[PDB]
Amino acid sequence: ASSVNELENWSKWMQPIPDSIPLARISIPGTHDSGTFKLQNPIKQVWGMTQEYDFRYQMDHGARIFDIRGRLTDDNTIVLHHGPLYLYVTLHEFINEAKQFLKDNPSETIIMSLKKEYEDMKGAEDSFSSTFEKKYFVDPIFLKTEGNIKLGDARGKIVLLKRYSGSNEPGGYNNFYWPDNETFTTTVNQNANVTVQEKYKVSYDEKVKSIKDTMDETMNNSEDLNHLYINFTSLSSGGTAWNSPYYYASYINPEIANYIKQKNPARVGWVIQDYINEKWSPLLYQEVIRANKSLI
């Protein structure tokens, strides 16, 4: 917890950061629609795929925020979906990957975002929220404290970001407004503000400026520990190749990485990207992690 070259260890980069720092203040990399890596079908890949590697690979590359979209089934379990498309990945599968990673690298923590992606199957017994909280959230790995959660309290546990409305169990970040397809700012608990930029389905130029504008506001508000910044760099238009999430990501990722490298900011926020890999020139996730050198 003294050297900045400790941030270069993607598997244990949160180790050098102080316990007292709220998770909201740390610049954290994330993945959009994390569980689409198994899609091998052509027509399906062009529309729904946003990641090419598994959960463990993502975690070993510094990613700490995961975008999980689920659906309640006839068997009373929760599986991962992209619209009406079953992804061949379950919620249990994600939690078990996260558990093993937290065991191997105890200085870290993972933030899990959960959202209901499609309507429940006919024969389900209970509701989406009830099934999640009774069969999953009850596991000791989930942090059950609320408020402006700090890194020290989060180490070794999973922190929930609720994007569903049925909740009855305390823990993590609660559900808030969140209007569809746009940038906004609201309130979470009693001690926090949130600014989100999730403009999917928008022109390329409009998207790039929305990301930069939101990122500029975060740099200028580096000391506001009570403000949470969530910035999605993913774009979803009309697949059909050369218009797919892959095409877009190959330009947006190197572009935004360089933008951070030039500005030398103290804070960048939570950046949820598509296609985390080692292909594109300057690495987006790496530049986000390095923006935390000011916390050390």
From Swiss-Prot:
Instruction: Please name the GO terms that the record assigns under molecular function.
Output: phosphatidylinositol diacylglycerol-lyase activity; phosphoric diester hydrolase activity
Q: Which GO terms describe its biological process?
A: lipid catabolic process
GO CC aspect terms: extracellular region
Keyword list, A-Z: Lipid degradation, Lipid metabolism, Lyase, Secreted, Signal
Q: Where is the active site?
A: H32, H82
Per the record, what are the reactions this protein catalyses? Answer: a 1,2-diacyl-sn-glycero-3-phospho-(1D-myo-inositol) = 1D-myo-inositol 1,2-cyclic phosphate + a 1,2-diacyl-sn-glycerol
Q: Name one Pfam family in it.
A: PI-PLC-X
Compartment(s) of residence: Secreted
Q: Which organism is it from?
A: Bacillus cereus
Q: Write down the CDD domains for this protein, in alphabetical order.
A: PI-PLCc (cd00137)
Q: Which PANTHER family match?
A: PTHR13593, SI:DKEY-266F7.9 (PTHR13593:SF113)
Residues in PI-PLC X-box domain copies = 22-163
- Any idea what job this protein has? Cleaves glycosylphosphatidylinositol (GPI) and phosphatidylinositol (PI) anchors but not PI phosphates.
According to its UniProt record, the EC number is 4.6.1.13
**Matching InterPro entries:** PI-PLC_domain, PLC-like_Pdiesterase_TIM-brl, PLipase_C_PInositol-sp_X_dom
Protein known as: 1-phosphatidylinositol phosphodiesterase
